[PDB]
Nucleic acid binder design. Structure first.
Lengths: 93, 100, 44, 65
RNA sequence: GAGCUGUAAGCAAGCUUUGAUCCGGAGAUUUCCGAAUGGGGAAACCCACCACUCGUAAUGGAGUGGUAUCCAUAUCUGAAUUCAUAGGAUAUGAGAAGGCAGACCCGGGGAACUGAAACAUCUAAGUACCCGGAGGAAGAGAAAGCAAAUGCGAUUCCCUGAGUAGCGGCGAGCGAAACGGGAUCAGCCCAAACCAAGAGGCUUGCCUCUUGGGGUUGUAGGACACUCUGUACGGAGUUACAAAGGAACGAGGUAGAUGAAGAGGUCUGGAAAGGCCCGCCAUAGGAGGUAACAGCCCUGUAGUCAAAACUUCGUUCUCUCCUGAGUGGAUCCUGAGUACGGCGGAACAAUUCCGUCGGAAUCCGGGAGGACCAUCUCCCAAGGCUAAAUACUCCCUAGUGACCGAUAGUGAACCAGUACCGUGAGGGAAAGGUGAAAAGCACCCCGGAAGGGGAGUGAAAGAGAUCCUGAAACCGUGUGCC
RNA sequence: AUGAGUAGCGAAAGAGGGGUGAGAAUCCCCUCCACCGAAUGCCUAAGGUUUCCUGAGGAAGGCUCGUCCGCUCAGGGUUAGU
């Protein structure tokens, strides 16, 4: 990473994500080459909060089809950041 | 040789002899929309735009070689030429010599 | 966005794999021939 | 900004603009994901601006050496 | 110079005459693998060290560069050996490492089937194939030649000689050369012997080490000694001719610009470019398109032009460099284990290749003309460099076919080396057509839908999505005669 | 095309009531009955690569059917200092 805004891509808005958000946990899509400490520091810098823990998944691509052609979607990296008893990242969802 | 906003006259087709105004141009296909010319009746299903739907009455593009501009001073059809007035090239009317 | 066959068989890759093909002049000849034909897939 | 203008600012001044633009993009992307972006054309415009700036910077550094 | 955001829909949001999309020249960025080169590795991934930077109280984390091997040049040290030397370390190296165009050419190795009706050699064939080296071309090249003449004078390529000579179980078959006619057309440089300078052994001398002048030759030349002649205002050149940079004009290439003349009337028609009756242009009657067959509707064509920037050629200037001809012929040189001989295999009086031993001459000197012995005739070996005429095209541009037209033509006119088959090397398909224009069927009716019947669009709906034409096999319904 | 509406369509236990639905032998629920039980149970490998969950679906596919599915289509879902 060079600028922390290149580590976080976009937030994840689902039912599971909205459920976890009430436990003070936030879910982001992360650059596939970023590691836990990188995400921790990026969230520290961008939002000015205190981070307690970070967990990361790796997701394979899915097979899709539009008519006769077949392909795969991109791989994804997902991070669940647990903030401490501090402020609240306003995702303005 | 003609562009949007020109007074033209149709030379070939069902609407031969009619004259109107260019409303759109499609240089990627050499087709052009002339008002009041080549009217179609599209049967359009109800949808978000035009909620009730029905049978429309619009124009359809004709080929650009079926149409020729009008000479400003005589009103008859003219072939196009290109002169450079003031460091700017202008379409000229071969029949007379006037611009556009 | 590809197709994989036996991505766990190590002997398959150690026999017909790319790095084994590139380890001798004959394997490099094989790769040159398959590139000349225009194959989508070179080796295993 | 057009190159002419970017070319007038000092290198440092350029770097700052790049930083700011990169923040705008972050925000724009988050809004899109949530569902609160109308001008989606803004995204592309910002990306190209960032490039215009980096191009000017490199050109100055090459010239130096 | 007016629209645009590819295919390619849709559906949003936008840009643009303060000039976008688009086309051409020059740049910038260029993740990871791959010769892949920090180490490892099941190619697209893991794990490091050094320096600097970001960050932490610190550990942990991140960014930017460097870190393979071999070779060369050095610099030091320097295993054996003290120096030296192997080596080690250090540096400097746009060095070389791999790919391909299934083509062309140099070198090395090198089959078998087949045929000879069998098989003895031979032929196939120095072919297929494998290995190494390259270049835009490549070895080839300026006589110790041809050959027998009134001689020609480097090399290469085409015609002819000639399917001849010749070689051939002389059988199959293999197979020349010279003369003559053409294409292209230039030949040069060194060593050697001599002169001048310094050193290094030697005692000066001597004698080699180097550097500058010198000189390139056979009806011999050079050295050498002596004459004129010069060092320029003349000549030559980066293509060999030792060597060697810029600057101006012209023509191209890589975008483009301009460019004549019919809405002629009238008939059929869905539509006129067609029929009939009239006109025009032409350095332009190539071609494509447009609702049917267009010179005059469009894009264009003939002819003229046009380049900021990269390039390809020419011409000139500039630049750089530079003696030849004589008289002699007292004395030296003209290419060392070579020319030639033996010894074996290889090859096959024998013939040559390579090794295996030997071993001259050198201008009054040698080598040749099938052998040897003599006459005469041509040449000058044991140093090097040279364009052109020729070979082939993976590619790019412009075109052309008494070439194919979807079982044809490339395997591939369509998301084809794809789908499929195989562990792998590898093998390898099928599949084009609505309509001029989606105007691609609102609405009503039966039906869960599919699919129909009306209505409507259209020239055509029996053109409704595998939608031009639509044969045969095959499958049905009705009916005249039995 | 013919063979030909022929041979197949394999074990092995189901029956009824209710529901859904255009349509039910075959899908869901209930009830009883029946089968395995050193497994036909529990977990977890190799291997497969989304087949997992929710909603929709009735082209194709599933030796009959289908309102169902390992099928189709949209969204989701995999969190380690031990």
């Amino acid at each position: 990473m060079k600028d922390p805004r290149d580590v976080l891509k976009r937030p994840v808005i689902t039912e599971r994500s909205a459920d976890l958000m009430t436990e003070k946990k936030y879910t982001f899509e992360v650059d596939v080459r970023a590691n836990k400490t990188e995400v921790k520091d990026a969230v520290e810098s961008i939002f000015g909060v205190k981070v307690d823990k970070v967990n990361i998944m790796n997701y394979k691509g899915k097979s899709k089809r539009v008519g006769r052609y077949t392909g795969m979607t991109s791989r994804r990296r997902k991070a669940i950041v647990k903030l401490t008893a501090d402020s609240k990242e306003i995702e303005i969802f | 040789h003609v562009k949007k906003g020109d007074k033209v006259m149709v030379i070939s087709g069902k609407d031969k002899g009619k004259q109107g105004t260019i409303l759109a141009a499609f240089p990627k296909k050499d087709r052009v929309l002339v008002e009041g010319v080549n009217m179609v009746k599209k049967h359009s299903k109800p949808t978000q735009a035009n909620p009730q739907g029905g049978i429309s009455n619009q124009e359809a593009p004709i080929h650009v070689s079926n149409v020729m501009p009008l000479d400003p001073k005589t009103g008859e059809v003219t072939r196009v030429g290109y002169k450079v007035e003031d460091g700017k090239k202008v379409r000229v009317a071969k029949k007379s010599g006037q611009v556009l | 966005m590809k197709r994989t066959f036996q991505p766990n068989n190590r002997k398959r890759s150690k026999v017909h794999g790319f790095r084994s093909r590139m380890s001798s002049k004959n394997g490099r000849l094989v790769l040159a021939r398959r590139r000349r034909k225009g194959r989508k897939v070179l080796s295993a | 900004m057009k190159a002419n203008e970017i070319r007038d600012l000092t290198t440092a001044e350029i770097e700052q603009k790049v930083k700011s633009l990169k923040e705008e993009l972050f925000n724009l992307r988050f809004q899109l994901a949530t569902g609160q972006l109308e001008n989606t054309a803004r995204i592309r415009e910002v990306r190209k601006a960032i490039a215009r700036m980096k191009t000017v910077i490199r050109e100055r550094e090459i010239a130096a050496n």
